[PDB]
Structures are given as C-alpha cells and as structure tokens.
Design a protein around this ligand. Structure first.
Ligand SMILES: Nc1ncnc2c1ncn2[C@@H]1O[C@H](COP(=O)(O)OP(=O)(O)OP(O)(O)=S)[C@@H](O)[C@H]1O
Ligand SMILES: Nc1ncnc2c1ncn2[C@@H]1O[C@H](COP(=O)(O)OP(=O)(O)OP(O)(O)=S)[C@@H](O)[C@H]1O
Ligand SMILES: Nc1ncnc2c1ncn2[C@@H]1O[C@H](COP(=O)(O)OP(=O)(O)OP(O)(O)=S)[C@@H](O)[C@H]1O
Ligand SMILES: [Mg+2]
Ligand SMILES: [Mg+2]
Ligand SMILES: [Mg+2]
Lengths: 432, 432, 432, 432
DNA sequence: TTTTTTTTTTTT
C-alpha cells in the first residue's frame, strides 16, 4: 500500500502530521517508491512543507537517475491521487506496513550478519556488526508503534512521580555506615560509581571489599577482572569473608578443615548471595561482551546480578570506536557512557576503578582534575570516591576517602573521612 | 561432518561423555542423520549405554520406518568407523557444527514466526510463538557451547580453589632469600615484572643475575635482547655462573682448561636448565615476534621456556599501534599490555626493565612518578623494583633496590633493602 | 615431490617433527598443493597437531574455494597415502626440494625487481627492494638448509663463545692507550659511541682524530658529515696526519711538494685504510640513506667500512618517522636507535656526536643529565664521552674527558684522564 | 641505441676515451651489434687507433662473417653517421644501455646455473659455476658504472684537493679587509652565516649592506625580504650604492637626473652583478618556497645566484612543522637547518639575521649562552657575527663587531673589531 | 591546515 501512503502524505495534512515523524526511506522499496519518497523527503527538508504534484515533477526533472527509474517515478507520481478515506484505517494500516517492513529489514540484516561472520577473517567486510548484536537489532524492529512518548509533565503526572519516592527499590544500601550516610541510603541502580586511587594504593581492594559486603547482604555480584585472573580476585574475597590474611593462605597457616568449616558456615547462612568472577584479557571486553556474558549467565547459570563490578574501565574496549582511532579523552568518555548505558539497561549498580595522573601519585591530596585518561569520565559518572594514602596513613592502617563527585548528596559535607583499610584481609572497616 | 559425529558417538567414549548432553535431534538433519540420531538416543534412553552397530541394525529391524528413508538410513549406518581422531579438534568441530545448525534453526523459526504474524488471526497457527519472543530465542541460539563453566563461583567452586593454595602452581622462587621474603614465594606465572633504574645503572646486570639464579633452579630461561646483542649477555651469564670476573675474560686471565672444566661441571648437574639468548634489532620485534620465536623454539628443539627476560620493553614495538602513530604513553602501555598477555598465555614469568626520567639520574631516591615513557606501565606491571646507585653505594659495591609496586605483598614491610652488587661478576648478593 | 612431502607430513610423526618448522607456503605451487598446505598449516596453527584425512576433507576443505580449486584439493587429498621410505632419504630429498624452490622464488623476485626498476618513477612500486639488494636475496636463498640455529644456547655453544673470547673478535683497538685501558681493548663492532663537547669545544676534532687513528690502524673509515662539507673534514684529516697546522694549509706556508710528498709517504704505508668522506645536507640523511651509500660504496669502489663516523647524530632524520615532530626526545632517540641498528647489521663501529645543554657551557664538569637533544640517546649508546675544557685547559692545550656512560667497563675506574688536545693540528695526544 | 654507440665510437674522441674501457663484446648482441663491436675491438687492438668508417668497412671486407652476418655488417656500417650529440646525454645513455645488458646477461647466467644444478650429477657441465657463485656474479653485474665518484676518497683525491686549497675554490671574499682577515679569505659556499641583531641594534641594515658589497664584486645576489617590500630593500641598496642618504630620497633632494646618471655609471662598469629582490609575507616563506623561487629564476630569469640573503630568520617558517610561532626555539632550529640544507644543495653563501637574549642586549659583550636562539643557532651556523650597538659606539658612528662562532677560523684570533656603520647610507666602512 | 584533549619532555 505504498501508493496510498504517498498519496495521503501529499493530499492529507492530518495524515502527514502523525505518520511523517516515523516514516523512513528503508520502508518502501528499492525502486520507484524509494525514489519518490526521497524526492518528497528532500522537498520537506528544504521547505518544511508537503510538495505538490507540480513540485514533485519539477524535482523529478532535476534528478540524475536513469531512464527506467525516471519512468517508474513518473508513473508512480501520475498514479498518486487523493481518495475518500478515514484517518483511523490509514494510521493503523500504515503502522502495520511500517512494522512489517522493519521486521523484514531486520531479518535481512540478521541473515547478512550471519553469512558475513561465517567468512575467513581479513575478508569479512568489516564495519558489519558481529553476531552478538543479533537480538538487539530485532529489539529495534519491535519498538516501532507510532506511539512516541512525548515526555513527563510536572503537574499532569505527579501521582506516578510520588509513587517513586517511598518505593526505594532504586537504592541499594551499602554495609558500611559512612558510605550509606554520605549517599543517603546507598548507591542507586543504573549508575556508574568510580574509585580513583592511583597505582597500588587500593582501588581493587576497595572493589573486592564492596563485592564482599554486597555478597553478605543477599546480593548477586558479578566481578569482572580485565587484568587480574579469577583466582586472585577469589583469593581476595576469601581473605575478606573468612577473616584469614592473604599471608596466611600463602604461608599455609590455615588448614583444610578450617577452610571447609568456614565455607560451609557461610553457605548455611540465608543472608548470602552468589558471587561470580569472570576474567577477560586487557582490552578484550566491551559493553556488548558484558551483555553477552549477562545473557549466558542468565541462561546457563540462572544468575541475575545486581551489583555488576568491572575492575578498570580504562582497561576495557569501546564497542563503537575503532581501537587507537580517537585520543584517550574521547575513547574513555565513550567507554564510560557505554558502561552507564549497560547499567541503566540491566538496572544494576555498576562499580569501577579509575587511575589518576602521574602528578597525583605520592600526594597528600587528590583533586578531580587529577583524573588520568579523560575529563569526561567525571562528567559521565554518578558517584566518584578518591582513595588517598600517605606514609602516615599507611603506618596507621588507614586511608582517606575524599568525595570527588557526589551525585547522591552534598559532597561538601563529610568530604574527607578515614577508612580503616586492612590490606592483609582486603577489607574496609569504619572508625566510628 | 555428521558421519564423524555419529561414528565417534557410537565408538569413542570421552567424546560421548563431553558432547552427549549438548545434543538434540534438531541439530542434525531431516533425513537419514536425524533418524540415526533418534535411534541412538532411544537406545541410550532405554539402556543407559552407547549402542553397537549390531544393536543399531536390530533397532532398525524392530523399529521400522518407511522404506524410502529406511534404505537411506541403513546405507547411512555402513560407514561409522573408529577413526581415532584427536579429542580437541573433534570437540571444537562438533561445537562449531551445532552452533551453525542452532543459528540456522533460530533464523528459520523467526522467519516462520514473522510469516505467521502476517497471516490473519482466523487461520494463524497457535503453536508458533508471538513476535515478541523473536529476540530472546535468538539469544538462546547465541549462547550455545560446550563450556559447562561460564566463570568462577565463590561458594560453588570453593574446592578446586583450595588446591591452588596447597600446591602453589603459580609461585616461582627467586633463589634469593630477601626477594622470596618480600614476595612470599617468588614471582607468579603470567605476570610482568620490571626493574627500573637510570641509564647504565644495572637493569641488564639484575636481569642477568635473575636469569642465572633461575637457570640454577632447573628453569628454561629465554633471554630476548632488542639491544646488548647476544654474546655480551652470555658473557655476563658466564661471569655470574663460572665465578670469573669480566675483566679476566677481556684480559686473558682464564684458560680454556678452566672454562671448559667449569662448563662441564655445570653440565653434569641435574639441577640445571637451559638458557637461550636471542637478539632482535632495537625496535624491530613485538609480541607476535615473540610468539613466533616461542613456536620455532618449541619446534626446532625441545625448549618451552618458563622464564622470559626481555631486556627492555621501551625499545620494543607494539603489535597493534602503527609505528609512531601515538605518543610514548599509549605505545608503551600497549607494549606492556601485549607482553603481559603473552605471559598469561604462555603461563611464564616475564621479567623486563624500564628507564627512569632524566630528573632521577642523580637522585638517591626513585619514586614511581620517575618512570620514563608511559605511566601505564606501572599500572600494567605486577611487580616493580627500583635500582638506585649513588657514590656512597658505589664505594661499597651496593645498590638500593626499592619496592615501587607489589601485587605479591605489602610494599611497606620491606620497602628499601641494600643489595651487594658485584659488577665484575654481574651478580647480586644479599647482605647477611 | 609435493605429494610425498604432504603424505609424510600427514602420516609420519618423525618426518613432521623434522621438516615442519622449515616449511613455507611459497614452496609448492600456485594450485592444489598450495591450498592443501594452507589447510594443513591452518589446522596445525589452530590445534598444534597434524591433521588427518577426515579433518582435511571435511573440517577444512569446506571453505571459500572455487570449483577448480575444490576439485584439485579433493584429488590431491584422496591421492595422499603413506609409503615406506627411509627417514634419511626423505629428509635429504625434502631439503633439496626446499632449496631448489627457494632459489626459484629468489630468481623470480630479482627478475621482478629488475623489471620494476626499469620502469620510470611514479609507477615504481615502492617498498620493493632496489637493484642493489639482488645479491643478498640470492645469498639468503642459498642458505635455506634445515639446521636448527635459533639463538645462542649457553651450554651448547660455549666453544664458539670461547673462540670469540680468545680471538677478541669484537674489539677494535684505539691508537691511544688511555682509551684502550678504559675500554679493555677498544670499541666493539655492533656499537654506537658518542662524543658530547658543546659548541666549538671539539666534537669534530675528536671525530677527525679518531678517524685518523683508525686510518693509521689499517681500517676502512667512512666519514658521513651532515654538518660539514666533503672538503672541510678532509683538510682536518690532512692536518692531523701530515703534522701541518690547519692555518698553514690556508695561508700557504706548505709547498705542494710537502703535501703530495707526505701523502705519497702515507700511501706507500700498508697500514693505511680509506677515509672516504661523504657530505649530506643538514637534516637530509637517514639510516636508509646510509645503507644506500654503503651499498653504492661496496658495488662501485669495493669499499666495506669497519668504522662509520657520523659527524652529528642530532641533525639527521628518522627513516621510521614519516611526519616531522617538534619533540626532540622522540626524534633523536629514533635516530640513535636506527643508527645502532645499522651498526649492528653492518658490524661496524659507529661513532657520532651529541650536543650538551646550555647549562653545561663553561661548566667545569658535565653530567649525563646535561644531554641536550634527548634523554633516550644515552640509553641507546654503548659508550659516551664528555669534553669539558672550560678555560684553563685551553691555555694548556688540554681537554678533560669524563666517561659519562661506559658499557665496555666500569666508568668509575678512570673517570678523568685529561686528554692533550691540539687544535692547530686537530688531534689528540696523550699526557704519558 | 647500438647504432649511436658504434657511430660515436667511430666518429668521436672524448666519447671513445671515456667509454672504451667499459665496453665488451657481450654487451651488444648476437648478430650485427656484437660483430660490429668485435670489428672495433679487433682494429683497436692491431692498430691502436679508431678505425675509419671505411676502415670499419675494411674490417667487414676482411673478416669471417656468414652471408647474413656479412650483409648485416655491411648494412650496419653503411648506417653510421658523424652526427653531433651532446656528450653528457651520450655517456649517460650508453652507461644505462651497458648496465641493462650486463644485468640481462647475469640473470641469464644464473638461470642457466640453476638449470644445470638440477641435472644428474654424472651428467652436467664442469665449466658452469656452482650455485654458490650466484650472489657474486650478480655483484659483478651491479659493479658496472662508467664513472665512480662516491664521496671524497682520501689518498685518491689528494691532487684535486690541493688544487682546492691553492685556488681557494670555496671562499667568497667580503670587500671588507677585517672580515676577510677573520674568515681566512671570506665566507664559503654551502654555508649559513648569521648576524646576531641585539637591542634594536639593527634590522636588515647589515644584510642590505652585504647585498651591496657582493653586488660590487660581481656576484648574483638574491635578497628575500619578509618584513619589507621590494622597493624598500632596493632603496636601501640604492642608498649604499649611489651614496645618497636614505632620507634624501624620501625628501626629494636628489633629482631624477643625478639618480639616472649614477645608475647608468654603475651599469657601465663590467664588475657589477645582478640583484633580485623577492618579497614574501611574514611566516609565509619556508625553505621550500625558496627552492621554487630559485627554480623559477633559473628557468625564466636565467638568474642562478651565488649569494642568498634572507631578511630575518625568525620571520621565516619551517617547511614541515605545521605550527608556527612568533618567537619559538624549535622553529628557529628547524629554519636554520633547512636554510643550511638549501645553501649546501645550491652551493651558495646564505646570510640571515636573528635576535638575541635581553642579557645580550644589556651587556656589551654577547655570549653564545646569551643568545635568544640557544643551541639552535650556534649549532647550524658556520659563522655567527654578534653586531651590538652602544650609545658610545653610536655617538662615534661605530658598532662593535664580536665573533661568537667561526667554523672558518679560530674564534679568538680577532674577536672584537670596531665597524664604521653609517645608518643613513646603510653602509659599513672600515676603521683604521 | 586548525582544534582539542593527555602525556612527556625540554627549555627558560
Ligand atoms: N597478595 C597480597 N598480600 C598482601 N598485600 C597485598 C597483596 N596484594 C596486594 N596487596 C596490598 O594491596 C595494595 C593495593 O592492592 P591493589 O588493589 O592490587 O592495588 P591496585 O591499585 O588495584 O593496583 P593497580 O595498579 O590499580 S592494577 C598494595 O599496595 C599492597 O600493599
Ligand atoms: N661490558 C661490561 N663490562 C664491564 N662492566 C660492565 C659492562 N656492562 C655493564 N657494566 C657495568 O654494569 C653497569 C650496568 O650495566 P647494564 O646493566 O648493562 O646497564 P643497564 O642498567 O641495563 O642500562 P643501559 O641498558 O646500559 S642504558 C655499568 O654501569 C657498569 O658499571
Ligand atoms: N681552521 C681552524 N683553525 C684553527 N682552529 C680551528 C679551525 N677550525 C676549527 N678550529 C677549532 O676547533 C674547534 C671547533 O670544533 P670543531 O671540530 O670544528 O667542531 P664544532 O665546531 O665543535 O662543532 P659545531 O656544531 O660546529 S660547534 C674550536 O676549538 C676551534 O678553535
Ligand atoms: Mg588493580
Ligand atoms: Mg639495556
Ligand atoms: Mg661542527
């Protein structure tokens, strides 16, 4: 029914107002229909009005396509004529036609991706998406229903807004009291929280301590280590949970009986979730890789995480920018934005680590301007905490956590407090 | 390869154990292959054992099909032979075949769903799923593999992680008591270890001493040199091992009797490894060149290294970044990441050296901020030591090895420790 | 004998382990044999084992091949069969076949090289080697035997190392005993030696004196002067060797009989080499230019230098770097690395010059931190020297040398030795 | 080409004496060309003189030739003319022909060697060289050049070098006795010479003066100005040459009659050169635009300069630096290198100006350390005169010339000298 | 040819 759609795009102002915002060039044909719609779209972009038959003929004469295409477009334009119709049958039929064409294009692209990925490398016609984003494309084929959400009205829609304040399902409480106090109830789902410490100051000890604390509070935690292996992170978690020093495990001061007893005692407790550690090579995982990991975890292991942790965003690969194409600023900003998009998609608290510049190392204070790889990371991150350690603090078994970007509350209040990091047990303890 | 799959299902046993749970009748065909697999599955369900060829013939006789296909099935079971193929290739090829067939089935299913949706509701099939199920089932076809483990589970896999604590399987001792003490068992496999010092301060001296100590502990050590050539390194090793000064070699104070006698005395030891010294042009070798070198070392001789000593990573080239496309920071970070990836792939301890800045060449203390080239090298490294030499230290044949970074222990317990350095013998001795 | 080679690759473990590491795809043909070897090589790379017939004709042959290629590969794979042949005749015949194919490929390559170079520019197919490097390709093709020579085994190659020690077949002695007692026999072959003096302090008087000494020692010397003309240097050499003041050759106090006669005196001496002087514009000569000059000298003048003296390292250009960089650190380091690579490739002692920092001007002592252009140059140099004659040594015709970096020995043993400069004769004399 | 070669062997003397030693029978053909050269070689041997074309015909008349050869030889002899080609093109073309024929013969010989090598050992030719001789044979093909001049060969070019010292082939006098005294006969070709303008001491006045003394000595001078127009610079030149004060021209004291009379008086003198003034915008002239200007002047104006004077080094731009700066050190160092490269490649004396440090401005004495361009100009400059002005020197109409860097001669011989600067006529006169 | 981030280096 392409002829009817074009005719009522021309000879119906009411029809054009609703269907146009959604009409696209890939929904008609590879011949006369697409060319006619391209003519109409160019005229609309140039004059912001629906062209007439004379305007279409003039644009057709000032066009460069061949004789066959010219004749087809001329016949199609000559066949366009308004008919007595009703707005509803046309809008519903157009929605059905657009949905069918979107599904057809999506399945054609799916077949193309499958037949392209099944090719020897270096001859796979790059810039074509991989099989990993096969379902997502189909998800885009179903989100076309002529029902775009205009937005949220402050006065018209306030009961629904008020039924989001006492819900509190968005906030995931910590286990430390100070972190809950500064965040006013803990971190929120669909966010990107960051730890900035430097090199060998913490920043993975803190992530492991957070993972252990969330695990004790009945949470499913997905640790993703882009550098350290799976047994080192698991060893850190074991040291945190079992209250056994990493030196004791290395020096064999803990027996198999004690280890088994502690593990079974933790297992028999109802207030304990599941922690899963996954390792990827440095620069070999992205947002799409994490989504594939999420899907295979949900299917194979029936594991649905809420506290997804990534060891370092700077070590991950952007899923949109080719490697080493853009500078550190753009690449890191894109990676952080994609991670935040993943977090809001799966509705999980995302925790990450970030390096500071060389000038901030061995300094008694770390500012937000000391971020290493990009200034956009603080802009695209919900909460950031700076971990500072000096010789005096190290001798006191304490670290100073400074609130650098506090989006859940006022950062001026409680800006710097001293945590009791214990490096042997990979644990954070409070001083209150 | 359905014939191979069926033959190794009937005959091979470990392949049957690994591949049978991930087998469905929809993966094979709609003809003789499907019928044969159905017969095998029925037999294995009746009797919990793999059938034989005579059993297959009996099942065909008692459980019959239409002769049209029955002839094709009986001629299909005439070629299944033992054919002792290797297990890894067979498993990988079967996995690829089942993944391809799953993708084909998912595409056909989504096409059928789309076709059914187009049909009017009066005559549309009821067993077919709705269009909304198209994405998820596609995901069900994306995550199909033979990997029963998707990650590391803290509570599920408490066993097989305690084994890694009893038997280290990662630690490699240092032959020096101070380094073992500050490392708690020595450097670990799949790690990048760095000695940082000023120009001609003794980066090669320390690396040669470590190589000699590893060689005395029955280790395969591969010394790759982008500079310093080859012979020069073997002379340093000879000075360390044969207890002859460098001046003696270049002044002719050692006879061929002493040299050959000491070499054969070392050869008679059963606790001696192999030391291959390889030379590459400065800036003319990368991680892939190292992988090719390892492959040719494994082929042309029975040499698989456990220690890999790269003389200086700064004078290597990245296997991803084009030459001089990026600055020092990005290139050196990429080189360090590639070297660590090589280390984790080969499960070897990779030692290397790095230069310090121009400002630290005449300083009694060297900080992590004094690293030359990238600041991401300390981030990528697993263990970094700073070699400091001053006039007072040189007057006593000693250096000031300082812990810059340590993923093996707390860097503050023994941060700075004096080490006697015999430059004539190119040897590190410990003060006792 | 391609069929026999492939058959015994598939069906012989000993033959495979003997001949596979020396196999290349450029040896068989441009038809079925090359495709079969590609399949075998891909299988061995992927699974580290020799493929079987089933793996070849099922798991691998189902790939992107045309009908003719598919038929040829099928026929060749079906024709493969194990044949009983002695495993001393097979290896020798395979080695002969490989050598013949390498020679054939080299001949075709040099024919293509000549055809390309015969064509006029703008169509000359860059990155293809010039006509000068025809003999090296043929020589490489000649030495294509199946001998395992990967690196320098420490225990297996101590005989050759001792031969190198006793022959001292790396040292090139100086004519000055002071420079021989600190270098333990002079400079080594594959080395980069540097002089740092300042502005109008030396830095070419020293290079000219070293060239004159090497000329008197029978060495072939190549003086590449980027900053000085081909004649300004020669005249300095004449002043050094003829014991005539540099001013006397300008005012005219030396008669032609003296000049020609003194020259004839040197010519009659059999311990005199060639000091060929070649000038390049300042900033217009790289390592590739020097290689072209070496090839031209070898072909035309039959001149193979043992000493290469570049008048100034910092006014050359980098062959690897394509876009000029305002950062002097990277450019000078790249130039030094390329020069040292050239030196180790040609086994020629390479002397050059470096500029000291303005702070070091009129300073009684010059440290290594006074290097001006780059801090990477001292890291790549094998031996550096500093000239620090400020004001009083000039009145006594003296120059003090500090020995800033010494890779031939301990630089703290004889740090200063107060060389006897003579600027009129442009030479160095000892203070014995 | 063979016809031309034989014709100019018969009918020329310089061509014969130049190309006969490099002429062989195998270089021509297997029919007319080779036989005809054989006749020339035969006659050149029995009678040591070039045969007459009739004598060459007499050789054909009296020689063993097959009917076809004898005819072929007669036709070729009748086809030789005494036409006059240019010598350089003839020598170059016959060299190329000889090189191509030698390469073809060597390639055919190595192919024949390889073919003979792949033959039954019992059955092969003994005279054919072994395969190992292939790389040497090609070398003999590449060692064919009518004239070998790769650089300056010491002990092989001493007679030519002496003719350079006596004839002062490189020196260009100054017309000022003091400047000739300190340069041992003037500046040299292929050099960069700069004057260190101090505190508002000067701006082009000196370079304009240098553009008059060279003009009076007969040299072609190209004055490139950036901060001035052509008319203004030529007005400064007129002031110096016509003895008219600079302000007198603007005021109008000098009339057209006197101006034209003085100009024609200068034109009558045969000891006068040509001055070409070219203007470029500030920062819009790198030392690659100057090459284009020289090419245009040579092609169109036939003006090949011996002196090139650039108004100001700082105003110039680097050919390949992209980013320019009003007063940046990196640009000045690059500009100096590019200008000196231009001087070397054009064999011209290049003069320019640069600013100095404020300390050099306040202090009457100027140190190389006290220079705006440090380690950049006193490294690429053969001569650097420090022209500074003092109120006392001003009151006496003088300027103290100090010699800060003299590659030509000893810097301390005559370092300080007083110059009679006239600021009105823009002139330098000597002081008794 | 400019523009902007980050780093590293060096010169004043
Ligand atoms: N095995 C161990 N035993 C004891 N202490 C350890 C051990 N590993 C690490 N530490 C301590 O933990 C501190 C911080 O460890 P990490 O969390 O790995 O630092 P980091 O910031 O994550 O390292 P990078 O540079 O970001 S990869 C170190 O400085 C050590 O003091
Ligand atoms: N060939 C040698 N003969 C004698 N002593 C040497 C020799 N090479 C090095 N040394 C001594 O050992 C010290 C360190 O040398 P290396 O370990 O080779 O240098 P490095 O720290 O690797 O730095 P580079 O690579 O030379 S910039 C020197 O400063 C000397 O004291
Ligand atoms: N013709 C000469 N007569 C006498 N002494 C000279 C002569 N040329 C140079 N010198 C002296 O030689 C030294 C100059 O060093 P050179 O060997 O020319 O190299 P350089 O000048 O230091 O290099 P740069 O980059 O040009 S500063 C000074 O001590 C001069 O006095
Ligand atoms: Mg970390
Ligand atoms: Mg080194
Ligand atoms: Mg010089």
């Amino acid at each position: 029914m392409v002829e009817i759609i074009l005719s009522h795009l021309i000879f119906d102002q009411a029809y054009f107002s609703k269907v146009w915002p959604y009409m696209d060039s890939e929904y008609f044909e590879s011949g006369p229909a697409k060319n006619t719609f391209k003519l109409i779209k160019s005229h609309v972009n140039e004059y912001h009005s629906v062209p007439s038959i004379n305007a279409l003929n003039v644009a057709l004469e000032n066009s460069s396509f061949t004789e066959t295409e010219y004749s087809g477009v001329k016949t199609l334009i000559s066949k366009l004529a308004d008919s007595p119709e009703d707005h509803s049958w046309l809008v519903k039929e157009t929605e059905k036609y657009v949905q069918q064409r979107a599904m057809f294009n999506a399945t054609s692209k799916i077949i193309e991706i499958q037949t392209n990925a099944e090719l020897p490398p270096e001859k796979r016609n790059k810039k074509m998406p991989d099989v990993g984003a096969i379902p997502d494309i189909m998800r885009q084929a179903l989100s076309i229903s002529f029902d775009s959400y205009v937005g949220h009205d402050w006065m018209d829609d306030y009961e629904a807004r008020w039924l989001s304040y006492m819900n509190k399902a968005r906030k995931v409480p910590f286990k430390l009291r100070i972190l809950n106090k500064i965040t006013k109830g803990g971190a929120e789902t669909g966010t990107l929280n960051v730890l900035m410490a430097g090199v060998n100051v913490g920043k993975s000890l803190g992530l492991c301590s957070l993972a252990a604390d969330y695990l004790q509070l009945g949470h499913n935690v997905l640790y993703i280590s882009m550098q350290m292996a799976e047994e080192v992170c698991a060893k850190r978690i074991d040291a945190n949970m079992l209250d056994v020093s990493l030196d004791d495990i290395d020096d064999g001061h803990i027996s198999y009986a004690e280890y088994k007893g502690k593990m079974e005692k933790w297992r028999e407790k109802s207030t304990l979730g599941r922690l899963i550690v996954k390792q990827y090579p440095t620069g070999g995982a992205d947002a799409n890789t994490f989504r594939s990991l999420l899907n295979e975890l949900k299917l194979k292991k029936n594991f649905v995480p809420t506290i997804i942790i990534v060891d370092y965003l700077g070590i991950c690969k952007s899923c949109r920018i080719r490697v080493y194409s853009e500078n550190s600023y753009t690449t890191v900003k894109a990676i952080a934005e994609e991670l935040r998009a993943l977090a809001v998609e799966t509705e999980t608290v995302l925790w990450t680590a970030a390096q500071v510049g060389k000038q901030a190392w061995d300094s008694s204070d770390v500012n937000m301007s000391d971020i290493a790889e990009s200034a956009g990371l603080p802009a695209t991150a919900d909460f950031m905490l700076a971990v500072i350690e000096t010789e005096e603090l190290a001798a006191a078994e304490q670290q100073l956590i400074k609130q650098i970007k506090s989006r859940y509350g006022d950062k001026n209040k409680w800006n710097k407090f001293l945590m009791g990091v214990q490096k042997g047990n990979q644990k954070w303890v409070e001083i209150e």
